[PDB]
């Protein structure tokens, strides 16, 4: 029964601290929230299963930050904003498979191969991060400072190659 409470303990703390910090430098502050919660406090005990919660929570924060960058990206992508996603997701690649969401999207993705290679060549995350790279996020990266175009090479192959 104590094992059941330990499993449910790591479970409810996993979803708790997971969705707690679920809501650049703010993700680096979330990586500093990954410092204070995981890499300082939880690192003391778990060089184990926080190593599993490097997958079960933190690559589930690359799955969760994946789908956060893959739901529908309104205006958080540009030549600086998605370059700040390199300060978020390629900074999540600072440690070994989390180079996903800043790949093939960080440079104001609004091209045919930026959308279609945001689907087929922005991998290690889910492939919903093309419509949230060049369909919402190139009418929205085109709506962002450092615009690159609301193309149908962007929006059509981003809403088509992904979906």
Q: What determination technique applies here? A: cryo-EM
- Pairs from 111-116 (Cβ < 8 Å, separation ≥ 24): 111/148, 111/149, 111/151, 111/153, 111/154, 112/151, 112/153, 112/154, 112/157, 114/138, 114/154, 115/153, 115/154, 115/155, 115/156, 115/157, 115/158, 115/161, 116/157, 116/158, 116/161
Resolution in angstrom units: 4.4
How many angstroms separate the CA atoms of 43 and 10, rounded? 14
104: left (phi over 0), alpha (psi -120 to 50) or beta: left
Residue 66 CA to its chain's centroid (Å): 3
Q: Quickly count: other Cβ atoms within 10 Å of residue 108's Cβ.
A: 27
Element (H, E) at 158: helix 152-158
Structure tokens at 113: 């191969």
DSSP 40-81: IIITTS-SSTTTTHIIIIISHHHHHHHHHTTS---S--SSSH
């Amino acid at each position: 029964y104590l094992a059941e409470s330990r499993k449910l303990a790591e479970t409810k703390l996993i979803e708790l601290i997971d969705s707690k910090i679920s809501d650049d430098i703010s993700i680096i502050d979330l990586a500093q929230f990954l410092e204070m919660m995981f890499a300082s406090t939880l690192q003391n005990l778990p060089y184990s299963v926080q190593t599993l919660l490097i997958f079960r929570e933190f690559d589930s924060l690359t799955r969760q930050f994946m789908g956060l960058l893959l739901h529908d990206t309104p205006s958080t992508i540009t030549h600086e904003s998605i370059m700040n996603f390199e300060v978020d997701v390629n900074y999540l690649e600072s440690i070994m498979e989390l180079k996903q969401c800043i790949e093939l999207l960080k440079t104001q993705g609004k091209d045919y191969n930026e959308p279609e290679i945001r689907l087929r060549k922005y991998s290690r995350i889910r492939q919903e991060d093309a419509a949230l790279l060049l369909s919402k996020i190139q009418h929205f990266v085109s709506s962002v400072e450092g615009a690159n175009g609301d193309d149908t090479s962007v929006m059509d192959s981003s809403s088509i190659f992904n979906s």
